[PDB]
From Swiss-Prot:
Coiled coil: none annotated. InterPro entries: LipOase (IPR000907), LipOase_C (IPR013819), LipOase_C_sf (IPR036226), LipOase_CS (IPR020834), LipOase_Fe_BS (IPR020833), LipOase_plant (IPR001246), Lipoxy_PLAT/LH2 (IPR042057), Lipoxygenase_dom_3 (IPR027433). SUPFAM superfamilies: Lipase/lipooxygenase domain (PLAT/LH2 domain) (SSF49723), Lipoxigenase (SSF48484). It is an enzyme of class 1 (oxidoreductase). Its EC number is 1.13.11.58. Binds 1 Fe cation per subunit. Iron is tightly bound. Residues 191-236 are annotated as: Disordered. It comes from Glycine max. Plant lipoxygenase may be involved in a number of diverse aspects of plant physiology including growth and development, pest resistance, and senescence or responses to wounding. It catalyzes the hydroperoxidation of lipids containing a cis,cis-1,4-pentadiene structure. This is Seed linoleate 9S-lipoxygenase-3. GO terms for cellular component: cytoplasm. The gene is LOX1.3. GO terms for biological process: fatty acid biosynthetic process; lipid oxidation; oxylipin biosynthetic process. CDD domains: PLAT_LH2.
């Protein structure tokens, strides 16, 4: 015989829930001690009748273990001594039953053994509901990573049964307690039944609007059309994908849900009433927003204070003033944002640093069909480029790759005639920039295009504006740049941030969980990079991207916003997301072996990329060491049933609209798996951090990143032109985002740029001890240590005076891609996952 000693570490529901956490021995713990929680061991050695493990007698939990050197916060440990003997062999898993009717978060189980066998660890981290809601029993497996042979033969059937239980068929309305994973189409976002005007086109499953699938939540469809699904306030996402917190303001999801639920209506009211004016009359009135805040009544102020998590997001006077924090962009100079040098610098080191291209043939073309400006070009004034700096000719400078383009002409042009039928007067833009002889970039022309003055075949109504610094000229130029910037803010929310990151990544979470058992080595590589992404994504469909959401209301594309993001999905090709691939695709880097990342950069002074290539290569070296420690040969891989099922399923199903694309890796080689895995970790950690954490630092001055255009360019000698002349600022303010959306936008982007105190960053942070594989842990440490070396290289780079696109006119050292951050609206820190 032998009693194996176990110590079960756990967390009680109230330690983790928002509704209790509203506050951040005492033997609650006694309740666990009746015939309340029972565990039961499973062998990885002795096999019953038809192989299936062998279950050592259900044991209940006795005695509270008061301390342990390792207990941590909100965790309770319990002791449980299992009866066991030589003849049952080694425990490799365990069943668990909660009878308490209050779920608890199981953290771990350690067994201190009986043969020459060290302490077996189980890293559970999962919610255990009441044993009656389940029809089977929650099984948990030990610490050992096994390739999909499903290795210890007693375990093989237990390994395939859970896999089967997490897929759980595509039927029914998913409940709070469920862990079923499956795909569905974006048919979730509109509400047809509150009017036809409230319908939104189903995204995915068709060619006009292809889209990545999202998690199936199983609700009853809409009444006025069965193809869409009923709205609801609680969107299901598989339990344990929804992450608890020990303190609030860490419930940053709660910040967003209540900003839309409660804050946006009560605030709305002051603009539908009168205590606030509706337009800002001066740049001064905007800068006063984080000086004294917005004088509002206590009917909004006491109502919008104690609502949890939205503390410090709103700095308050105490009463009648909701302040905002100064965004980093004006902390050294309140006026440097207007600088050409800055507008051009944010294309490389800004919130959206990701899009610029080396112009190869002038004039840039559209890539729009037979409606003949696609089969035609940019009307840009070749004979109006280079205002003082270098006087080369066009091809001399294209030979030198000194000209670059921000082309925002094509995604919005189909929808422009419609966006301009409403209240917003958008302007399809492109802008040619010349790399100043000293490393900086300089905007030489913006081309403001409209559709179809008389028609729509040969429909491009282009007007190019050129830089100037005195009089109406500079005021017109400023509004011109304002029209680029507003286009780049919808492109950044809907495509660079939500599409290229949150939407694209959710099929992988669903496919991984449905097919790669927890034990699998690849699953443990990938798992930490999925933390809360299905949860924040559940809330985006509930509030951010739905029928009357903040994005529809706050961004240029308006109601056509996510549909336009699905048209651009037409072009998303998985492999060009890989950073050096992306830099080449855009003609920002040429291949060159000699140069330290296998490619040479045009605009070498370029921060996002110089820094990010460092983090890419670090991820790629980690994943290659990890992959190659389990796969012996390419045949090992090709034979892996769990990896193969997985890849098959997200190509054909999760990214089902794209199933037939020729660029997809067939997972037949290692190095193809290094590449797929390296791209998903990049997207889930450094791309989303790069694209998301500079949002308030830059976009907190609505002046510097406006989201909405209300007027077309001031005409000739007309009273709008005369208003410019006699009051440029009031003219500016009434072209860009009105004040009620400026206030909604700074609330939502303030939250989106916040690091929760319990953020697990890329910087080596896993979160307990996930594997037995010493080789892996060691390799993990090398990753973590290379990242610390990277952070120092990157900060050293911010002090090189010869690198000025790192800082620019309002000395804002590019810190977005430094791995660690402490906790706030810190402009750095790469999380492991898309979490906000
Ligand atoms: Fe995000």
């Amino acid at each position: 015989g032998h009693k194996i000693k176990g110590t079960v570490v756990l967390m009680r529901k109230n330690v983790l829930d928002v509704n209790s956490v509203t506050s951040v021995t005492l033997d609650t713990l006694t309740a666990f001690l009746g015939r309340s929680v029972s565990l039961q061991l499973i062998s990885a050695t002795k096999a019953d009748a038809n192989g299936k493990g062998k279950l050592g007698k259900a044991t209940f939990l006795e005695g509270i273990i008061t301390s342990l050197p390792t207990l941590g916060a909100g965790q309770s440990a319990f002791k449980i001594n299992f009866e066991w003997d030589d003849g049952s062999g080694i425990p490799g898993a365990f069943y668990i039953k909660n009878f308490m009717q209050t779920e608890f978060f199981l953290v771990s189980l350690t067994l201190e053994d009986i043969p020459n066998h060290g302490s077996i660890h189980f890293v559970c981290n999962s919610w255990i509901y009441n044993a009656k809601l389940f029809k089977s029993d929650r099984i948990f497996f030990a610490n050992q990573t096994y390739l999909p042979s499903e290795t210890p033969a007693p375990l093989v059937k237990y390994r395939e049964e859970e896999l089967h239980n997490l897929r759980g068929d595509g039927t029914g309305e998913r409940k709070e307690w469920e862990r079923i994973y499956d795909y569905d189409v974006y048919n979730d976002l509109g509400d047809p039944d509150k009017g036809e005007n409230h319908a939104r086109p189903v995204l995915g499953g068709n060619d006009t609007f292809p889209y990545p699938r999202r998690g199936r939540t199983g609700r009853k469809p809409t009444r006025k059309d069965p193809n869409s699904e009923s709205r609801s306030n609680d969107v299901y996402l598989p339990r344990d994908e929804a992450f608890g917190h020990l303190k609030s303001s860490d419930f940053l999801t709660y910040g967003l849900k209540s900003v839309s639920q409660n804050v946006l209506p009560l605030l709305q009211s002051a603009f539908d009433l009168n205590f606030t004016p509706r337009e800002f009359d001066s740049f001064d009135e905007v800068h006063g927003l984080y000086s004294g805040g917005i004088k509002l009544p206590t009917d909004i102020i006491s109502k919008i204070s104690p609502l949890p998590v939205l503390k410090e997001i709103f700095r308050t006077d105490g009463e009648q003033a909701l302040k905002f924090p100064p965004p980093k962009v004006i902390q050294v100079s309140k006026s440097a944002w207007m600088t050409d040098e800055e507008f051009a610098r944010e294309m490389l080191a800004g919130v959206n640093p990701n899009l610029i291209r080396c112009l190869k043939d002038f004039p840039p073309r559209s890539k729009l069909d037979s409606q003949v400006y696609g089969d035609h070009t940019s009307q840009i004034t070749k004979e109006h480029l280079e205002p003082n700096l270098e006087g080369l000719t066009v091809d001399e400078a294209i030979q030198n790759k000194r000209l670059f383009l921000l082309d925002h002409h094509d995604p919005i042009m189909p929808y422009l005639r419609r966006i301009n039928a409403t209240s917003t007067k958008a302007y399809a833009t492109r802008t040619i920039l010349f790399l100043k002889n000293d490393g900086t970039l300089r905007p030489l022309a913006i081309e403001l295009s409209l559709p179809h003055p008389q028609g729509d075949q040969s429909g491009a109504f282009s007007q190019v504006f050129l830089p100037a610094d005195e009089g109406v000229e500079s005021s017109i130029w400023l509004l011109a740049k304002a029209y680029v910037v507003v286009n780049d803010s919808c492109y950044h929310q809907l495509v660079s941030h939500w599409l290229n990151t949150h939407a694209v990544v959710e099929p992988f979470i669903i496919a991984t969980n449905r097919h790669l058992s927890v034990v699998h080595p690849i699953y443990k590589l990938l798992h930490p990079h999925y933390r809360d992404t299905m949860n924040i994504n559940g809330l985006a469909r509930l509030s951010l991207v739905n029928d009357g959401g903040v994005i529809e209301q706050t961004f240029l594309w308006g109601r056509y916003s996510v549909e336009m993001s699905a048209v651009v999905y037409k072009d998303w090709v998985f492999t060009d997301q890989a950073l050096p691939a992306d830099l080449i695709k855009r003609g920002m880097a040429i291949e060159d072996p000699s140069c330290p990342h296998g490619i040479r950069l045009v605009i070498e002074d370029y921060p996002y990329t110089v820094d990010g290539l460092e983090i890419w290569d670090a991820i790629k070296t980690w994943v290659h060491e990890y992959v190659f420690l389990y796969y012996k040969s390419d045949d090992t891989l090709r034979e892996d049933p769990e990896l193969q099922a997985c890849w098959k399923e997200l190509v054909e199903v999760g990214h089902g609209d794209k199933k037939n694309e020729p660029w997809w890796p067939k997972m037949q080689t290692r190095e193809e798996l290094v590449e797929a895995c390296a791209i998903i970790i990049w997207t889930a950690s450094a791309l989303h951090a790069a694209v998301n954490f500079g949002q308030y630092p830059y976009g907190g001055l609505i002046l510097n990143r406006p989201t909405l255009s209300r007027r077309f360019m001031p005409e000739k000698g007309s009273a709008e032109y005369e208003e410019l002349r006699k009051n440029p600022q009031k003219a500016y303010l009434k072209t860009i985002t009105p004040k009620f959306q400026t206030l909604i936008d700074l609330s939502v982007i303030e939250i989106l740029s916040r690091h929760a105190s319990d953020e697990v960053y890329l910087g080596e942070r896993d979160n307990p001890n996930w594997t037995s594989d010493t080789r892996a842990l060691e390799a993990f440490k090398r990753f973590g240590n290379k990242l610390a070396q990277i952070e120092n290289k990157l900060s050293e780079r911010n002090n090189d005076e010869k690198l000025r696109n790192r800082c620019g006119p309002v000395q804002m050292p590019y810190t977005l891609l430094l791995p660690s951050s402490k906790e706030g609206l810190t402009f750095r820190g790469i999380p492991n996952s898309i979490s906000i």
